[PDB]
Design a protein around this ligand. Structure first.
Ligand SMILES: CCCCCCCCCCCCCCCC(=O)OC[C@H](COP(=O)(O)OC[C@@H](O)CO)OC(=O)CCCCCCCCCCCCCCC
Ligand SMILES: CCCCCCCCCCCCCCCC(=O)OC[C@H](COP(=O)(O)OC[C@@H](O)CO)OC(=O)CCCCCCCCCCCCCCC
Ligand SMILES: [Ca+2]
Ligand SMILES: [Ca+2]
Length: 1037
């Protein structure tokens, strides 16, 4: 017979799936082992090898005694794991130095083996053995002994047991030259516990597990088919017909996909995905020491396989569109009819569902973070559980358990899906205790275990359990957007109306209560979550639309035979809308450019709009009170107003968002907008790089001074300069920064530079200059003083503008003046910045062959005050009769903090970012700017080692200072330790093509402290047990 066959098959297949799937984590795996030796080509030349883990698994080194005899009297590095002139190299690295009397080994601010030099060069000493491993950091000087102290007579071994004392390796640097001596050699064993590939056994077990689970579910299907019920071959009318709500939702989703905003964590996911295939494992790439997101990481591998085609924004986030359409179909054609005949008979409920799904999908679930996919999985789970309860079969329950497992394996906030299994638990238990009689217990229970457990074969493919435990150890040791509450405003009324009246005429109790309990359970899980509650709201997009479709029926006049309650509900909706129109931080970093309200709350007329909604709420509530006092019923006006409040509210918010985005596009057309760039991607577009402009050499367009008799200030002051002095700038003023006395991460080389220069400029200046300006070609004038103050003027010489041509005039849209002080100028974030006057006065050549002025131009001064920053003067605001131009500066403030400093102007020689950086140079793109710079190549990493970057792109000042500098600091596991220790940064002069007051971000050039070349690593392989760990990593002292 076939029933007994299917029983046996189900049992054996499910048990095998459970066993093998539990065993996948503990099974062996092949790891590639890299190691690094510094003398490579038999010559003493420096070498770079930036480890992303900021420490090796072990280090050994051997140094003869003769090398000390070869250096000069003032020797230096015999070797070091970072350059001696680097930033905090003596705090983060190993250094073997010779200070003219002592041969010192300095591990991180710790002096191990400090020994005289006249002994090491003697005839007794032979070698120096240095070893840093988990057992400690020790150094032995063979042939010698301790002469002084309590340790006298015993060997010259010295050091400390501390596994957190292992150095940070970004190379092997020295000061020696020539051939290599016999014995000098280091050996670093790099940590590569994450980059692996499976054995044949593990792979075969995973494949057999998936096959057996499929076999078991097929056999359980053949067992569920024992009842005479069948699926009819015809499709129903609802899946065949099409409506207008379908068109509205689909069109809105498409238009928002192209034109609309994007989430905040996009570059995070994109850079992880792009670097995963070269690495060999999904790394976070910004934090936590190259540790993976592998326990919740398979969607990222889907994105990584997608990146092999293109990295555009219109392709990599197609899953959002797919999942949106799937949610809409499953919600309109499987969720609403099963709630009852009332729902799916009305149109208002369908409009409510569609519009709420739109409004919740818009700010959050358009991007790359998987919140919308989680919502889709939860909806699929609910649908399959309801189909199981209705049809009485157990296969959709198993498929729903599988879907819940995967939805949890996307992101830890997928536990919402599991809530469905907690709601539809007792029905499935009833089914199991009902079918236990006909067929036994194990044929049913085994496939469910196999379904729940098959996720371990996908989640632990390229990883083991020890790696995951280590990654969690690091993540726990180190630390860790319009408001929408349609969810709550729809959960409260449906809840109270299901509690008030027991049974509703034409509505199902079970499905509604299950949906409501799902939502309450996940809100419970989320209030315990340390992250802010409002950020995780895209999970309630589809289920929230379902609850809205339910709520629009439980408040209509067909059930609520009282007007006062409906007016109260209207007051509630309007109060909610006011609370959502007030609390809005804005949009995030590229959608907030052309939006109407960028630095305020909405304000039309003469007072904010939230006040108008609170006022409408007040009228509604007082009207309800009057209805209560007149004790009337069934007034036609209320039946006209309270026909459908929720769809009207949702449509209002939808139209608001779409209008904001379309206004941002039309107001900001030729330069960057999300929609314009995405439309441009089909034609070879590259995003913000196409619009952003940069000066390769920031001294290229300095204008020629006309002839004149001038003073010691030079041509810049001019014929009566008062209160301006060439060295009139404070000690430490730098480019786009403030130079706090205590340091910060991710800072340029200008911070730690000296105060004064060794050689003065043309005029008697000593001030450093920001953007690579050579003080032998660029004068300065400033008014800061310390003995007594005075009112200061400056009116420079007429600087001859270049020429009168059209192509040149098109390529040269600016005249720029570098200045530091409190200067007035327009902007976007904060317009009309009050302060002192630095203006650009232009001329028109008279008929006598002589000059005479016409007017002035006011700048666009974006950037931190009182930093060295570029002041922008467009050439569109200048008449084409212009031939000459001068600076006019006034200081009418006797306070010691209101000071001015200026340089001469320049018509820069610009070009785009894509024309200079290209798509082959490595770049350190922060986690905010990856979706606008897709064509740029990030700094990959493979086998523990990274690539030395040549550039760094970053967001605006406050975001760089508050978000990225702190996230990927070296103390927390980021990449800026490597760059701060190995490289020296310098900020560049960048502009945006037609928004001269917008702060798109910053571009920084990296230069090398010392000349060096990449390393030739040595490879091998080892097979592990699955539970193997070579001790813990270094994360903390
Ligand atoms: C990767 C994501 C794939 C999602 C699949 C969703 C398909 C939805 C649209 C299909 C068109 C159907 C037209 C049939 C028209 C039709 O006859 O309706 C098919 C059936 C309802 O059938 P009838 O209406 O004939 O049912 C009898 C009733 O009329 C009487 O009550 O609806 C379903 O069961 C749909 C749900 C399938 C869901 C299966 C999902 C299982 C795979 C899980 C994927 C996991 C994703 C992981 C997380 C991201
Ligand atoms: C009831 C059964 C339902 C179907 C269950 C899924 C079927 C199995 C398909 C994936 C097995 C993994 C691939 C083999 C594993 C293998 O042999 O290669 C393991 C491979 C090791 O490669 P290396 O470490 O050399 O490099 C990989 C790197 O290049 C990328 O990280 O790592 C991967 O590529 C990670 C796999 C990502 C997996 C992406 C797929 C995620 C599942 C998508 C389907 C989920 C929805 C299911 C609907 C219910
Ligand atoms: Ca791997
Ligand atoms: Ca002053």
């Amino acid at each position: 017979k076939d029933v007994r066959i299917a029983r046996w098959v189900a049992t054996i297949a499910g048990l095998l799936g459970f066993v093998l799937s539990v065993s996948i984590p503990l099974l062996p795996v092949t790891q590639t082992t890299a190691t690094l030796n510094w003398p490579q080509q038999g010559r003493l030349d420096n070498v770079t090898a930036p480890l992303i883990s900021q420490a090796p698994l072990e280090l050994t080194a051997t140094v003869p005694c003769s090398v000390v005899r070869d250096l000069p009297p003032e020797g230096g590095l015999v070797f070091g794991t970072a350059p001696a002139e680097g930033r905090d190299a003596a705090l983060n690295a190993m250094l073997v130095n010779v200070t003219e009397t002592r041969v010192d080994v300095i591990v991180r601010n710790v002096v191990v083996a400090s020994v005289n030099r006249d002994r090491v060069a003697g005839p007794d000493c032979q070698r120096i053995e240095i070893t840093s491993n988990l057992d400690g950091t020790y150094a032995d000087f063979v042939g010698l002994t301790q002469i002084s102290g309590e340790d006298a007579g015993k060997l010259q071994r010295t050091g400390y047991p501390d596994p957190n004392l292992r150095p940070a390796i970004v190379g092997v640097f020295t000061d020696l030259t020539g051939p290599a001596p016999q014995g000098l050699s280091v050996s670093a064993e790099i940590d590569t516990r994450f980059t692996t590939h499976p054995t044949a056994l593990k792979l075969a077990a995973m494949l057999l597990a998936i096959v057996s689970t499929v076999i078991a579910l097929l056999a359980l299907w053949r067992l569920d088919r024992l009842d005479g019920r069948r699926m009819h071959r015809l499709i129903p009318t609802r899946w065949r017909t099409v409506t207008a709500v379908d068109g509205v939702v689909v069109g809105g989703m498409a238009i928002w996909y192209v034109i609309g905003a994007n989430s905040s964590d996009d570059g995070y996911i994109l850079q992880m995905a792009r670097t995963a295939e070269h690495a060999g494992y999904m790394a976070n790439y910004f934090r936590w020491f190259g540790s993976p997101e592998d326990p919740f990481g398979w969607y990222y591998n889907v994105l990584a396989l997608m990146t092999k085609v293109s990295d555009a924004s219109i392709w990599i986030r197609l899953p959002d569109l797919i999942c949106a359409l799937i949610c809409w179909l499953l919600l309109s054609r499987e969720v609403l009819p099963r709630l009852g005949p009332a729902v799916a008979g009305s149109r208002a409920a369908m409009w409510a569902a569609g519009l709420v799904l739109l409004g919740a999908w818009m700010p959050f679930n358009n991007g790359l973070r998987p919140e919308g996919q989680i919502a889709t999985g939860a909806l699929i789970t609910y649908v399959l559980i309801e189909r199981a309860v209705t049809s009485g079969r157990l296969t959709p329950a198993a498929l729903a358990i599988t879907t819940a497992a995967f939805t949890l394996g996307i992101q830890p906030t997928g536990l919402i899906a599991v809530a469905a299994l907690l709601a539809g638990g007792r029905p499935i238990l009833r089914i199991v205790m009902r079918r236990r009689r006909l067929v036994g217990t194990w044929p049913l229970i085994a496939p469910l275990l196999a379904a729940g457990t098959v996720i371990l074969a996908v989640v632990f493919a390229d990883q083991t359990i020890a790696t995951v435990l280590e990654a969690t150890r690091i993540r726990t040791a180190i630390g860790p957007r319009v408001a929408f509450v349609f969810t709550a405003m729809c959960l409260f009324p449906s809840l109270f109306m299901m509690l008030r009246r027991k049974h509703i005429a034409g509505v199902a109790r079970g499905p509604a209560w299950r949906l409501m309990g799902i939502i309450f359970a996940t809100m419970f899980f989320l209030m315990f979550t340390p992250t802010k509650w409002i950020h995780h709201f895209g999970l309630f997009a589809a289920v929230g639309g379902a609850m809205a479709a339910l709520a629009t029926v439980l408040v209509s006049p067909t059930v609520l035979r009282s007007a006062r309650n409906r007016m109260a509900f209207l007051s509630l909706v309007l109060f909610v809308l006011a609370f959502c129109f007030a609390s809005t931080n804005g949009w995030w970093y590229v959608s907030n450019f052309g939006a109407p309200f960028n630095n305020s709350v909405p304000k039309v007329g003469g007072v904010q709009i939230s006040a108008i909604f609170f006022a409408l709420s007040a009228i509604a509530a007082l009207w309800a009170f009057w209805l209560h006092l007149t004790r009337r019923t069934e007034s036609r006006v209320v039946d006209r107003l309270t026909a459908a409040p929720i769809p009207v509210a949702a449509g209002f918010m939808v139209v608001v968002m779409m209008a904001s985005m379309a206004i941002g596009v039309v107001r900001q057309y030729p330069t960057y907008s999300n929609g314009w760039a995405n439309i441009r991607a089909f034609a070879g577009g590259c995003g913000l790089a196409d619009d952003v402009l940069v000066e390769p050499d920031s001294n290229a367009g300095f204008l020629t001074p006309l002839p004149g008799a001038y003073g010691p200030l030079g041509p810049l002051g001019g014929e009566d300069p008062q209160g301006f002095s060439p060295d009139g700038v404070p000690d430490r003023i730098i480019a786009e920064a403030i130079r706090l006395n205590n340091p910060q991460p991710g800072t340029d080389y200008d911070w730690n530079r000296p105060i004064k220069l060794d050689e003065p400029g043309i005029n008697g200046s000593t001030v450093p200059l920001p953007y690579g300006l050579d003080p032998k070609r660029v004068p300065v004038a400033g008014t800061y003083s310390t003995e007594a103050q005075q009112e200061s003027r400056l009116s420079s010489a007429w600087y001859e503008l270049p020429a009168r041509d059209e192509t040149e005039r098109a390529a040269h849209p600016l005249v720029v003046i570098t200045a530091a002080g409190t200067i007035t100028g327009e902007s976007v974030a904060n317009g009309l910045t009050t302060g002192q006057t630095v203006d650009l006065e232009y001329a028109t050549r008279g008929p006598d062959g002589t000059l005479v002025p016409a007017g002035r131009v006011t700048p666009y001064d974006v950037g931190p005050t009182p930093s060295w920053r570029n002041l922008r003067y467009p050439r569109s605001e200048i008449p084409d009769d212009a031939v000459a131009v001068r600076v006019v500066a006034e200081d009418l403030s006797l306070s010691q903090g209101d000071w001015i400093a200026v340089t001469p102007p320049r018509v820069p020689e610009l070009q785009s970012v894509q024309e200079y950086v290209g798509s082959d140079q490595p770049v350190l793109m922060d986690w905010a700017v990856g979706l606008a710079f897709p064509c740029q190549q990030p700094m990959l990493h493979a086998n523990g080692v990274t690539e030395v970057p040549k550039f760094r792109i970053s967001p605006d000042y406050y975001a760089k200072l508050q978000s990225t500098d702190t996230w990927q600091d070296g103390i927390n596991g980021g990449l800026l330790g490597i760059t701060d220790l190995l490289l020296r940064a310098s900020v560049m002069s960048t502009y945006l093509s037609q928004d001269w007051g917008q702060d798109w971000g910053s571009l920084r050039k990296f230069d090398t402290v010392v000349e060096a070349t990449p390393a030739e690593l040595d490879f091998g392989s080892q097979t592990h047990s699955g539970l193997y760990s070579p001790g813990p990593l270094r994360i903390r002292p």
